Amino acid sequence: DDNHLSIVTLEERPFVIVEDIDLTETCVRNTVPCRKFVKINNSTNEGMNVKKCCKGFCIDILKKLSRTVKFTYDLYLVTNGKHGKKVNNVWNGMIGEVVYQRAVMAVGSLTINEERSEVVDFSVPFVETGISVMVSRGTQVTGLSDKKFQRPHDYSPPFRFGTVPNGSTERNIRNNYPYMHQYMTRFNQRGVEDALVSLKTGKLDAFIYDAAVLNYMARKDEGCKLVTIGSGYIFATTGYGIALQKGSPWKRQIDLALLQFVGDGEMEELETLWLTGIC
Amino acid sequence: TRLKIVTIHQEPFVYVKPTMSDGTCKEEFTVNGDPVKKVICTGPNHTVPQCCYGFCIDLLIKLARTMNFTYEVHLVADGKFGTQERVNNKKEWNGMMGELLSGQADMIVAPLTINNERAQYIEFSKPFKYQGLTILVKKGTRITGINDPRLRNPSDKFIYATVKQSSVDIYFRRQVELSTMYRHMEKHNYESAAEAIQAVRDNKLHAFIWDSAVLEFEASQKCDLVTTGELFFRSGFGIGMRKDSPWKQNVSLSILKSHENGFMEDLDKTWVRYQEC
């Protein structure tokens, strides 16, 4: 029917958290049914659909939208990729499921950019993000545009800062601050966890990464020793948005519902519930 | 083709200065040495040509170049952003919202807040500026923020307000749990942000609730004024268009690209960001 929507999502705590069905064969508590096509091994396309239970910040948004926009859904986790890249002229991830009409919309920590907006429509952003900076509490830097980053050699001792390679942040820095990117290569980290350790252990002065992620890690940092820059100094500001098919008849109602949630304070409630920590 | 742009005086996003005697705008450069791009904007001072420049004017010029359209800029006649009001049985919008819906303008290029109430009738672009609401006070006034008892239990002793017919007016109108605060504010709301800011310096107004992109700028220039409580609400500015506009898609794509390539960073540094006192 026209009112039952296929919706794709991506496991990414705390925005989307996946659990096993409890014992019954149903999802309880604050979770919703979501299926996953689990591969047989890493060298095959064969697999099996498995019933899971999904919960989180983005799931509660989906529950709010389903109730307000008045639609039902079948939620499933993407398997080919993560959020979405254009690999060999083909979109994978959550973007691909929408572009190739396998999903009506995609819910998750999906950053709005110009590249993706050409193949999918994005809703209004429900969470602000961008390129931010995290330092040990006390260190003085503005945003990415600080001269201490653009020209690290102009200062003594020069700042030691990096990111996680092959991500959106490095791709932006490579295009906008070429020398900063060249300087960062010898300071890049395996992941977020190894970056925060480098900041605490004095091996790294600044970590440059997604704004929403850095803010979430800062609010639950043990000892509250890591802090992010103010929102006014975030570079290339954007947001997490819900992707839809181009010309979708649902985008108008989704936008009004999302803007209502921001105005209602329901969005703040979800941020306090899922994203705010103890710092 | 030839779009009728409507805007509003709101530093640092839009500056309004008189023309010179010969009817042109004086050549001027920023503190950093970049040329100040000024366009002729008509409006009330009867209608008179004036000079407009700023963050939003730089944005308009970038949009007109990217999508290749011409424009003429005028200032909104009533001087308001836009709220929806009952007509002495129907409803109508005032301010820039009203001029967009009436055809007096084809595109709103201003620090125009994106909200549900306006989005029901017009198309907003993706945000070209992320910010929020904060409180401005005279340096020495002590309030925690939007939850201060002098704001949540108002009286004639501590006067706070916002701008009439604006998004903040909508924000306090829609929430029934804010009706106590709104009932105080509607007795004191000002016609424009500039008059409200001036009233705080004159100690005629004790707290001004407004956009943080504007309030923090005013605090950086006028050291007798400070902000407090920080962002209790988060909102963004977007380009305003009618739902039938053929420029909708490319305006948002252009704004997204301008964020990604550092163009918005240039505007934010040139106009919005200044050193604290």
Ligand SMILES: O=C(O)CCc1ccc2c(ccc3cc(C(=O)N4CCN[C@@H](C(=O)O)[C@H]4C(=O)O)ccc32)c1
């Ligand atoms: O503490 C824990 O349990 C885990 C703590 C923890 C660490 C890392 C993460 C998250 C959450 C989300 C996330 C998303 C990206 C991520 O790929 N992008 C940013 C969102 N947007 C993604 C995209 O749209 O492509 C992408 C990006 O824009 O670069 C990277 C790391 C984390 C949580």
